[PDB]
């Protein structure tokens, strides 16, 4: 838990809080398997004082490769009021996501959640697991993926990974739950690789809203997906107008 020098994107800051922008490849907090260059690491170089808070104001977090908004609570009082409005489901997150095959609606997977048996670094539905619910609807269709927007009623490890999954829907790119399977039959050359390319979760935070836990003030921040999630969507967008056009000029 020493301090790092290590970039971060700060979208926002006060007196209380910093809302980042969190890139891949960057886990929040130390554990099994990376014992520093995580966001705490980042926090206490950006700000030492911050040290003396709890778990570096990390409220709450967000996978290794997945991207998107989180905030940061700089003091103690700042930190227990984000826990709590997160506990009260106050504080909303809002994720994009692109998803494996075709769907043809939007719904909500309550399935609960366990650690998995045999793998160590895996989650997995399981009827004695634990309660969690995810809520996602349909933003736009594609050929054999779909693009999707989430929300969610509890925030567990993997959750939105593996509720995807167990519906048979992974997110393109994941390397844990099926999301990189063959690509789809009539790809081009651009769109085989592209899926080759993208090796990580298809899963942003793009929306985070809140009451600022001192004034109490409502606030709301948007993220843009990123690049490589930019670049995925206007293939397959290419891939699925292609397709469209097949008797178009018939």
């Known amino acids: 838990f020493e301090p790092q ?23 929040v907090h130390p554990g099994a398997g990376n014992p520093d260059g995580t966001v705490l690491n980042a926090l206490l170089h950006y700000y030492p004082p911050i040290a003396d808070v709890p778990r570096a104001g ?57 650690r998995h048996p045999t793998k160590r670094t895996h989650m997995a539905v399981h009827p004695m697991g634990k309660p969690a619910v995810t809520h996602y609807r349909i933003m736009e269709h594609f050929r054999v993926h779909t693009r999707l927007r989430l929300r969610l009623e509890t925030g567990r490890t993997h959750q939105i990974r593996v509720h995807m999954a167990h519906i048979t829907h992974p997110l393109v790119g994941d390397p844990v739950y099926g999301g990189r399977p063959r690509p789809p039959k009539g790809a081009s050359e651009a769109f085989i690789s592209t899926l080759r390319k993208f090796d990580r979760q298809a899963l942003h935070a793009t929306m985070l809203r809140l009451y600022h836990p001192i004034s109490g003030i409502e606030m709301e921040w948007h993220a843009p997906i990123p690049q490589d999630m930019v670049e995925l969507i206007e293939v397959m967008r290419a891939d699925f107008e292609e397709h469209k056009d097949e008797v178009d000029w018939l």
């Open 5 to 27: 020098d290590i970039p971060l994107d700060i979208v926002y800051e006060d007196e209380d809080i910093i809302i980042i922008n969190k890139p891949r490849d960057l886990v």
């Open 58 to 114: 990390i409220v709450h977090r967000l996978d290794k490769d997945t991207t998107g908004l989180m905030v940061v609570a700089k003091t103690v009082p700042a930190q227990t009021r984000l826990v709590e409005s997160l506990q009260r489901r106050e504080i909303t997150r809002e994720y994009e996501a692109v998803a494996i095959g075709h769907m043809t609606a939007g719904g909500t997977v309550d399935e609960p959640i366990s």
